[PDB]
Design a protein around this ligand. Structure first.
Ligand SMILES: *[C@@H]1O[C@H](CO)[C@@H](O[C@@H]2O[C@H](CO)[C@@H](O)[C@H](O)[C@H]2NC(C)=O)[C@H](O)[C@H]1NC(C)=O
Ligand SMILES: *[C@@H]1O[C@H](CO)[C@@H](O)[C@H](O)[C@H]1NC(C)=O
Ligand SMILES: *[C@@H]1O[C@H](CO)[C@@H](O)[C@H](O)[C@H]1NC(C)=O
Ligand SMILES: *[C@@H]1O[C@H](CO)[C@@H](O)[C@H](O)[C@H]1NC(C)=O
Lengths: 144, 50
């Protein structure tokens, strides 16, 4: 689970919010993207190096006007792992109040297979993106 | 004539505060919808100041 999509038309009719976190860094950009049917991110598997590598970034195809753009600092995260059960939990809360896109986050270690962790955890704010756009529907972005 | 500045004149509903809309679609003033770039009872959403 890497990123999300936010917008109201998603076909270059209006503006949309792009939030992607791939193997290099987090990118936050607002353009008039042309989202295809099934946008995702592709990662090669076992290329005789005993490791993984991302090679596909099929999310959009064009951008006429961009009002916001942000690129975080680059980092190195692993793209491998094979466990019999889930190990990490990612909780997020997104709200669009008066153009402010509040983003909350919290991480906690879990040990479950196919159930939601029953418990309690507080959520802290992380960033406030003044996108000022009209959001109606969203879509997540998974890894291949 | 400085017509470089445009303003929106037709809309279906009032937008929320602190919201920016760059929609350039032809507005439908009549009961019948509009298509293409022009038409009867259709108007351009932007207009230039004098
Ligand atoms: C180890 O990984 C590197 C890059 O992560 C591989 O190099 C790429 O290999 C593919 C396979 O055809 C090529 O299409 C790319 O052009 C190569 N990239 C570069 C920068 O050379 C490398 O092949 C992997 N090791 C082995 C043994 O396959
Ligand atoms: C995705 O990762 C590649 C390297 O694997 C990097 O070059 C690229 O900038 C990343 N994508 C974005 C949007 O930063
Ligand atoms: C969209 O692209 C066209 C052609 O590149 C350009 O003329 C137009 O100004 C762009 N839209 C906006 C809002 O600038
Ligand atoms: C936001 O988009 C939805 C769906 O396109 C629409 O129903 C609503 O009127 C829009 N609101 C504004 C303020 O543009």
């Amino acid at each position: 689970i890497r990123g999300w999509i936010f917008g109201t038309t998603l076909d270059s009719k209006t503006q949309s919010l792009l939030i992607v976190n791939n193997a290099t860094n987090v990118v936050i950009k607002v353009c008039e993207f042309q989202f295809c049917n099934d946008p995702f991110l592709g990662v090669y598997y076992h290329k005789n190096n005993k490791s993984w590598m991302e090679s596909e970034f099929r999310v959009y195809s064009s951008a006429n006007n961009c009002t916001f753009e942000y690129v975080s600092q680059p980092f190195l995260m692993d793209l491998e792992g094979k466990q019999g059960n889930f190990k990490n939990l990612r909780e997020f809360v997104f709200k669009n109040i008066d153009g402010y896109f509040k983003i909350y986050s919290k991480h906690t270690p879990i040990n479950l297979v196919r159930d939601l962790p029953q418990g309690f955890s507080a959520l802290e704010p992380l960033v406030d993106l003044p996108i000022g756009i009209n959001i109606t529907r969203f879509q997540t972005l998974l890894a291949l | 004539g400085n017509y470089n500045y445009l303003y929106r004149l037709f809309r279906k509903s009032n937008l929320k505060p602190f919201e920016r809309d760059i929609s350039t679609e032809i507005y439908q003033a009549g009961s019948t919808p509009c298509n293409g770039v022009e038409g009867f009872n259709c108007y351009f959403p932007l207009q230039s100041y004098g």
